[PDB]
C-alpha cells in the first residue's frame, strides 16, 4: 500500500545531470550483471 | 543484426568472450521509448 | 612512468547459458527520508 502525498503550492528546483541516485542505480547493475552473465573469458586491464 | 561473441564490456574497461549462441529461436519484443542523438557543430544544417 | 606496463589479465569463470529477462526494480528511500 504505497504512500503518496500531493504537495500544495510548493515549487522546487530539480537537476537531472547531478542526481546522486543515478550513481546508485549504476552500482546495483554492475553488481547485477557480474553475478548474472558470468563470462567464459574476461580481459580486464590491471595497469600496475 | 549480428550476434557477436567477443564484446566490449560496458561495466568497466575490458573485453569479454562468451559462449556460442543457443540452438533454438530467439524472440525479442521491445518497445522503443527513447533515442540518444548528438550534433556536430560546423560553420549550416 | 609514461609507457607503463599494463598486464591485460584474463580470468576465466565457469560460464553456462543463462536466461536474462529484466524485471522492474524500483528504488525506495529508508526511514526518515
Amino acid at each position, epitope marked *: 500500500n504505497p504512500q503518496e502525498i500531493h504537495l500544495e503550492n510548493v515549487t522546487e528546483e530539480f537537476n537531472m545531470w547531478k542526481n546522486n541516485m543515478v550513481e546508485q542505480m549504476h552500482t546495483d547493475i554492475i553488481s547485477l550483471w557480474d553475478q548474472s552473465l558470468k563470462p*567464459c573469458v574476461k580481459l580486464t586491464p590491471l595497469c600496475v | 543484426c549480428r550476434i557477436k561473441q567477443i564484446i566490449n564490456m560496458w561495466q568497466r574497461i575490458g573485453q569479454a*568472450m562468451y*559462449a556460442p549462441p543457443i540452438q533454438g529461436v530467439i524472440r525479442c519484443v521491445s518497445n522503443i521509448t527513447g533515442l540518444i542523438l548528438t550534433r556536430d557543430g560546423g560553420s549550416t544544417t | 612512468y609514461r609507457l607503463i606496463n599494463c598486464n591485460t589479465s584474463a580470468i*576465466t569463470q565457469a560460464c553456462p547459458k543463462v536466461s536474462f529477462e529484466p524485471i522492474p526494480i524500483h528504488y525506495c528511500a529508508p526511514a526518515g527520508f
Partner: antibody
Amino acid sequence: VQLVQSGAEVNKPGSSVKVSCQASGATLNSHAFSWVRQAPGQGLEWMAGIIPIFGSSHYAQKFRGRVTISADESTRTVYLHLRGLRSDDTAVYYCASNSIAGVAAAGDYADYDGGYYYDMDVWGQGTTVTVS
Amino acid sequence: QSILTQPPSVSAAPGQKVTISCSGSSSNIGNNDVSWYQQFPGTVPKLVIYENNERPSGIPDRFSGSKSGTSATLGITGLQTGDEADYYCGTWDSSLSAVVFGGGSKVTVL
C-alpha cells in the same frame, strides 16, 4: 594447469579406441584442445582438434572420417574416438591445448570456422595405444 | 609425410651456435606464425619458442627464432650438454586446414 589422460590400451585391428583427457581448469571454453600422436621413433603429426568457445572442430585431411572428437563441458574431459584401427596406429597419443584468449584483440568479427591452434604448452602425460 | 623440410639432425660442439631450418610453403609460414617444441625421448614434449621469437618462463635465452620469407630459423647460441632432445617446428597450414609439423631435428653434442 595440468591434463590427465586415460589408461593405456591394447587392441586388435578393426575396433574403435577411446582416450580421455581431463582438464584441471574451470571450463574448457578457454582452451583450444588438440590431439597429436607419435609413432615410436618417428616424427610428430597433428590428428585433430576442437575449440569449444566456437563449437568448431578441425580434422587433418589424412584423418577425415576415421576420427571424431567430442568434448564434455560438465565433466571437463576431451574425448577422442578413432574408428578403423589398422597396423600403424601403434603409437602414443597426446592431448594439448593453448589459451584461446588471443583473439580478443582481433578485428571485430573474427573467424568462426578458422583455426586458432598455435604454440600449445599444456601437453598431457600421454597414452600408449598398441594394436595387434 | 614431412611437409616442412626440417633437417633430421644438426650437430655442433658444446658451447657454439646451431641453426635449425623449418622451410615451408606460402600457406603455412609465409602467412602464419611458427613455433618450436622440445621433446626428450620418452618424456612428453615441451614448448620452447612461441610467437616466433619469445620464450616461456623457464626457458634459457639461448634459444632464438626468426621468420624469414617462407622459412624459419631456430638458433641456440652457446650449446650446452643438457639439450639432448629433438626439436619440431609446428605451424598452421591454411591450405591444408590443419596444424602441420616438421620431420624432427635431433641435436647432438660433440
